[PDB]
Write a protein that binds this ligand. Structure first.
Ligand SMILES: NC(=O)c1ccc[n+]([C@@H]2O[C@H](COP(=O)([O-])OP(=O)(O)OC[C@H]3O[C@@H](n4cnc5c(N)ncnc54)[C@H](O)[C@@H]3O)[C@@H](O)[C@H]2O)c1
Ligand SMILES: NC(=O)c1ccc[n+]([C@@H]2O[C@H](COP(=O)([O-])OP(=O)(O)OC[C@H]3O[C@@H](n4cnc5c(N)ncnc54)[C@H](O)[C@@H]3O)[C@@H](O)[C@H]2O)c1
Ligand SMILES: [Cl-]
Lengths: 365, 365
């Protein structure tokens, strides 16, 4: 009879939810009791949770909720808040990797006799995260990649892709990319060849998924993972592709995929780099041709080349925000097996690892 | 505007389908035209396919269907069919690994100018299968493993687990297993510990799923993969578990996981071994404790031991046939993205690889 209480998000702009109406309903089928906070920034209507069996409660009511409820939320809590945290919480606390005030954070739990299970460290036994936002970052990344290539075909070099905003569902995004894509083809541009390094992961998968839905031929989509890069870069297949999408979780050092001298070639076809990895400050960044982390309001940045057509990078570090409903559905569904195991949290190693990680980190203050 | 024609299976006791009413409905929405044969032996009611929007046609219609329709089936043609095969066919034809009659099968295509796209060699660019039957193999294996362990609590050593028969659905199989599991716990047996090697793969995840659905604590389920076995065998944890489920894909020699010397021990708790891999014939076999390939009517074989309690092996090589419905849903769902590229089969690499494989084996006659 586990009880869960979905905290409304307070980080501004944040529209994703850690439980969606669909998983709330699955959870109720399993005998969970579920409270959901009314949150007007959430991309899900409160009515959808109500049809699903949720008990609707006011925003912020977690604070005064009985200490049997598990508080589940997605992003970290207000800085303004300094009161002791008494419940077990599930959330991204962003305090395990020395982000300043991480001690304040843990202090509030220590003083409350409260527990943090950190979404970011829910792993299976082999070290893979159970729930991440990969797919839709890759999906959204690819989609702006296409809109950027398309914009370069229909507008002069001195206009940049304008400021982009989130979409209420996937079908609305695909229609808009599709429209821009068809406009590009009317100018006589060749359909893009799109190179994806790291294609077998979550984001690679989403990228590929977007491209199909948009209508780029399958043979136009090159799908590289470990074995295709193993010789080491730079790779000639990068300047030659129209769009290059870097998905990939960087760990090892690794040689660069491409560099300024290979890209300064008047035979270069590459219009658009979409760095889903966005490991820009890393000293082994496989694509060191840019520095700016782009954002929604300014989604692309020029790569100053001496030769070839105008080349731009997308390096948004918050891509799944483009599609909050779908990023929330896939993530909640990724999380749900482990949620089903909350009645066993005191012995299930997914939950025990996360409690021990918490223990290890409190010992550090 | 592809047309697909779902052929009725003729292989004795084959109840699965390559397309389910559910993927038919998704394919129709992408603008495919789908005809479904009305099947005596299929686990789906023809109404389900009719209400998904298939056109219903008699058994055997594919034989004279126009050559615009792609004929999709699951298993092999009757050995006794000799007429020329004129269509594009998608199925498991089993003639690429030199099975007796492989030329005869190919000859039927050569005489007819047909084309085989073999379901078994449908793979991505990194050489991994797009669609296999792993999950419900592991799920059905685990059910049978838990049901054997339990039988050994409630019955005597001279009795073996009774013959099993396909189930109409998951819930039914789960209700049986749960009941037998509940009775076994009344005898004061310890909740079993189940070790799964190959846990991360398709069959591993199926095995984990069943175990959860029957209420085996997550902490009792030891989920091992490539990392956990690198030190190499034998492994002391195998004799110490109640149940061991081998879900590995075996691709090179590796030291055995266990052996009779280690099994021949007063202290051993291991009661039931489920070899889902069922690589009995292979020299690399990592559990060579048994020689017999068990079957539904006789699903365990005795392992003779000189010490410890009664031990059995389950080595059924057609586990997915016990849940033909679910097995079909999961297969058809995995194959679905590939079926969506059929308009592009002449250039989509996944299909071009299969056409290429076919032209290679044809040249061989
Ligand atoms: N920009 C964003 O908004 C955003 C959002 C979420 C995640 N991410 C980031 O995206 C990256 C990947 O996410 P993911 O979930 O898809 O990881 P993932 O593990 O699922 O995929 C990583 C893939 O890249 C492959 N790979 C690793 N190194 C490689 C190399 N040298 N050459 C070729 N292939 C290689 C891996 O084998 C794997 O298939 C991570 O850095 C993640 O933090 C970014
Ligand atoms: N018995 C049946 O009815 C039936 C039906 C389908 C498949 N299978 C068999 O199932 C086996 C696996 O099927 P799958 O779809 O789960 O394969 P899979 O590739 O999806 O997963 C195989 C897993 O084994 C792991 N692994 C490989 N070698 C290992 C080792 N030495 N130690 C530990 N882990 C190892 C891999 O990392 C992978 O996670 C295959 O041999 C297939 O032939 C049997
Ligand atoms: Cl073209």
């Amino acid at each position: 009879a586990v009880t869960l209480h979905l905290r409304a998000e307070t980080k501004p702009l944040e529209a994703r939810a850690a439980l969606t109406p669909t998983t709330v309903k699955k959870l109720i089928a399993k005998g969970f009791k579920i409270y959901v906070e009314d949150s007007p920034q959430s991309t899900f209507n409160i009515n959808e949770y109500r049809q699903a069996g949720a008990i609707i409660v006011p925003a912020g009511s977690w604070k005064t909720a009985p200490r049997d409820r598990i508080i589940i939320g997605l992003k970290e809590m207000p800085e303004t808040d300094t009161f002791p945290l008494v419940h077990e919480h599930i959330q991204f606390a962003h305090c395990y990797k020395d982000q300043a005030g991480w001690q304040n954070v843990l202090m509030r739990f220590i003083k409350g006799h409260g527990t943090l299970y950190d979404l970011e460290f829910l792993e299976n036994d082999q070290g893979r995260r159970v729930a991440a936002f990969g797919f839709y970052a890759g999906f959204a990344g690819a989609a702006l990649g296409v809109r950027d290539w398309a914009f370069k075909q229909t507008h002069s070099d001195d206009e940049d892709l304008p400021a982009v905003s989130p979409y209420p569902n996937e079908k609305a995004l695909v229609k808009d990319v599709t429209k821009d894509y068809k406009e590009a083809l009317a100018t006589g541009a060749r359909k893009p060849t799109v190179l994806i390094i790291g294609a077998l992961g979550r984001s690679g998968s989403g990228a590929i998924d977007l491209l199909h839905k948009v209508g780029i031929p399958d043979a136009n989509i090159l799908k590289w993972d470990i074995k295709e890069t193993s010789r080491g870069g730079p790779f000639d297949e990068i300047p030659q592709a129209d769009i290059f999408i870097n998905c990939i979780y960087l760990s090892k050092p690794i040689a660069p995929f491409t560099n300024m001298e290979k890209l300064n070639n008047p035979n270069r076809r590459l219009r658009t780099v979409v760095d889903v990895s966005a490991d820009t400050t890393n000293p082994h960044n496989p694509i060191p041709i840019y520095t700016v982390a782009t954002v929604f309001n300014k989604p692309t940045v020029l790569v100053p080349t001496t030769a070839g057509p105008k080349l731009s990078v997308i390096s948004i570090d918050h891509l799944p925000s483009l599609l909050p409903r779908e990023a929330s559905e896939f993530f909640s569904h990724d999380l749900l097996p482990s949620l089903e195991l909350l009645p066993q949290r005191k012995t299930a190693p997914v939950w025990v690892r996360a409690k021990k990680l918490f223990d290890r980190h409190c010992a550090r203050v």
